[model samples]
Target: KVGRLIYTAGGYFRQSLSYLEAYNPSNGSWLRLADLQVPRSGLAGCVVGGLLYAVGGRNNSPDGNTDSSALDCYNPMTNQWSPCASMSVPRNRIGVGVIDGHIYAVGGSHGCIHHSSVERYEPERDEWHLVAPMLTRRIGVGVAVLNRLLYAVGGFDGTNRLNSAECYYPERNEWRMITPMNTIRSGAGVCVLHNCIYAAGGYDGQDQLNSVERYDVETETWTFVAPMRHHRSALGITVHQGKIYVLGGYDGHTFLDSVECYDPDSDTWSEVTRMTSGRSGVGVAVTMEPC
Candidate 1:
């Protein structure tokens, strides 16, 4: 069931069944799973120790801001839902991930202004600890863990789009500046593949971008990659079955249902089956595969 499956968030829902469906890349078929506890758009999600964690996003009301701090965990094996610890500060359109068994909730607008808050969740103690705040307050940023270091990339800071990036080290409990992106943008999709960090389509303030950027951890530099055919923002990216997938984002005015895949070795992007509905700002998680 986990071999070639892709899970996406932020897609518009007509009914509860829409979110529950899983698309199989090989056959292009969909299978229903458990529905999310809340109906939201533009959230982010990641997996750790076999559990899927969904965090932060706005609801149906476009002008209305949800700014939810709720963190929910889904168990694929059992098809059940349980509450994890909530974020210290509520935020929508934020990024979330788990590294080395710790849950991290990072960067998003807090309604009045953008936030640089970075917090870690410890399951053993059932508590959240404040980590070093980001260098810049950002919303709709992309996050990924590469070489044991957490990388937080491009997002909006209210006034302008950001091309800057930073990394967090749990060992030092601090954040360090890394190479900035090639283009200034926000709401892009980010993922780590073959020890490299890849950032996909996002809005560059003036327009939606189809350009893709890659950061080489060894050199501490960024390089351009194959651009996506369609421009998107507030999308979700994840790696599964040795390939990277970008899913569900908005193309400036309209939400998108398109899905794209990146093959690291080939350095190319190809179209994949679209989701049931258009969505942006959703979370994503992949099931753990046995080593």
Candidate 2:
């Protein structure tokens, strides 16, 4: 398999930050690329075609307010970043994905309140349209695409941390609840690897969590996996080669700059290099590394 490309966006440990960077897995190094036009964090990142998109997120602090609608796209070939059509409404803590080349921004929060509204991006027209809403209103949720279905996983629903899970059907433009996670969590790092959806570290409403779980689409079930080395929330997740990478996050007391990688074959995590600085509320995008 060809290698993969990695990109990370807005972050906030103490204050709002907008620097973006690229990772070289071959040599295990990171390089500063460009800065977001807007300084914000809690943003969502996605890879659509050859471009990297930084979607809706918060502007300043971790509070519900300061939510943003900034939609920016970066081209690796030219290393050029530019503005794109923004979301119809400002949303933060969003779950972003791409299906059939169209980008989808899933359920997110407007303020302290949660949202079930879903939106689709038509890159051809450079505009957005509303799509089927989610079954659950949430923030701190995790989303992944597997076999053409968009899976929205655990999150806080204002009143409680949830284990409820659901998936979206592109053909029907609808959502249906599925088997819930074994454990309740929010702010978890989720992504797909080897046809399975992996959910990693996050907060459990009351505590930071390091436990990891994976969902088997073929069986419609989830089982425990090796836990990460550190309890974390608001971390960045991406798949490279056959491994899952977990980036900087908050460990309850301090912001983390450390990195970790999970090899499914080995069923374990190994600490990798650290970032230039600590970050949380970060957005990460990965592309198949050029041959």
Candidate 3:
């Protein structure tokens, strides 16, 4: 798939947007794709088995319970959308991941309540079932899977903006506490880049932040890294071309259309081409999800 980067559904102006687009590295441009059947924002999406799955997210209707359980898959070959089995509960702004061919929905808010509930989706069976709940009920936590382990990073753990970090062991069905981060922030962007987990700009409860942190799993430690060019929260993150790209998000003052890139070798950040417009609640995936 040549590491194709897909940017999909997000809402603006308290209204939902449906169109999806992918960035073409060869041309340094974004090419629009088909619209989603269900217009949603803050949705979680991932690709496995050559199909992209859009999980539950908010609808921005200002109505009661905007989070949805709708799951839809996009096929790159045919350029079409189709429904799949829905999640057990409706969720919004959740952390979604894929491992060993199955999809996972992590901690997020359901309605106005933060949830610790976790679920797994089996594409083969077209079904979803509950998994071991997280140790902390959090909203906007960053989740990333590496080496068969899933790490749920910082977020608002109901009462306080968190500096805590935890890792899930599927073999034991347990969540273990890890070293806390240097900063207490939630809604930060996270991804694995060259064996390190990079957490970028997020809100610290008082103000939006541009600080970034890096975690070394093998050593079980967290350290700071070069911050992004701009402060961002509720961002879209994905790895492409051996570099990590942090996409559109909110900068406290406004929704940001700008995108930034990080180079692990140089330990630096640089501004890149901006997106069409400022936005948040957007989803990003590399290589039609990834190989």
Candidate 4:
């Protein structure tokens, strides 16, 4: 029988990457997959109908490059990547969420320009269309969906590291500001679990933060949970088997390859197996083995 696995793709160490790899939680084994069409960092990724989509991000190569509007879809069955319709805007450090098989690309920055702009992708038509933008321009934002609503969490807004947040309603194609986080965070990792959204480690402009916060959507309030063992930003986070796993990122001093998870029941954090290479700004997605 096939099982679910976690995929990490296109990130940075000293340079951008096209690296793609997967981790099997059940067996605790990591396997390499096909590289992205273009080496990218700070991209967004999600799954739709068993396919993995890696969206826009910057190309930080030695020669230097601007942000991208490129889109690459990975078919596990064939282990190949196919280019898809790109977003209207170049976005790096964007947030992506899939609903009803459509992928939404939220706020990100191109050059020094941070945006509140949003776009939607139709897989079948291979097309992209502009949607209502977010209420605020956010770079390195953490975007997730809960109760059919898309939440855009903390990030740098070009002016300052932000604590503010907002949510998007597709039916209305509108965004509404929500309660802000307790701390300013950019490049944070966010995931939904147990009906609550958790915002993990990030940068506060001055320092890498290990702090974590949980948002109760019903109450519209955020509360502090146990902080992580290490201070990190630009990490990858996702839910698996009722736990929230946070992967590689940058500490204040250097890149990291560490992995950690939080247990809601215990309200604590612990280390897990590390990644093959230290990285930051990585794209993460959860997918199942193709039978």
Query: Clash number for every model?
Result: 9, 2, 0, 0
Report the Cα lDDT for candidate 4.
0.90
What would the per-residue lDDT of candidate 4 be over residues 1-291, giving only the tens digit for each residue?
259888998999888999999998888899898888889999988999989999999999999977999889998888899999989999999999887889999989999889889999999999999899898899999998888899999998888999998989889988999899999999999889977888999988899999999899999999999999989999999888899999999998878898898988999889988999999999998888633
The whole-model lDDT of each prediction reads 0.78, 0.86, 0.80, 0.90
Ranking by TM-score: 4, 2, 3, 1
- Per residue, candidate 3 scores C-alpha lDDT tens digits across 167-276 of 88988988999888899878888788777777888889987789999899999888898888999888888877778888888888888887888888898888777777
Q: Each prediction's Cα RMSD?
A: 2.9, 2.1, 2.2, 1.2
Model 1, range 206-280, lDDT digits (tens) per residue? 888889989999998899988987898877788887888887777877777888888878888898878777776
Query: Between 2 and 3, whose TM-score is larger?
Result: 2
Name the best candidate (by TM-score): 4
Writing each residue's lDDT as its tens digit, candidate 2 over 1-291 gives: 445667888888777788888788888877788788887787889988878899988888456348887789987777778999989888788888788888888777887769888899999999999998998897878988988889899988889888888999999999999899998989899899987888898888788889999999989899989999999999999888889999899998889998899999989999987888999988998864432
Flag the better candidate by lDDT, 1 or 4. Answer: 4
Looking at model 2, which ten-residue stretch has the lowest summed lDDT? 282-291
What candidate 4 gets wrong by more than 4 Å, as runs, is none
What's each prediction's TM-score? 0.91, 0.95, 0.94, 0.97
Those runs of model 3 whose alpha carbons end farther than 4 Å from true positions after fitting are: 1-3, 11-13, 62-65, 288-291
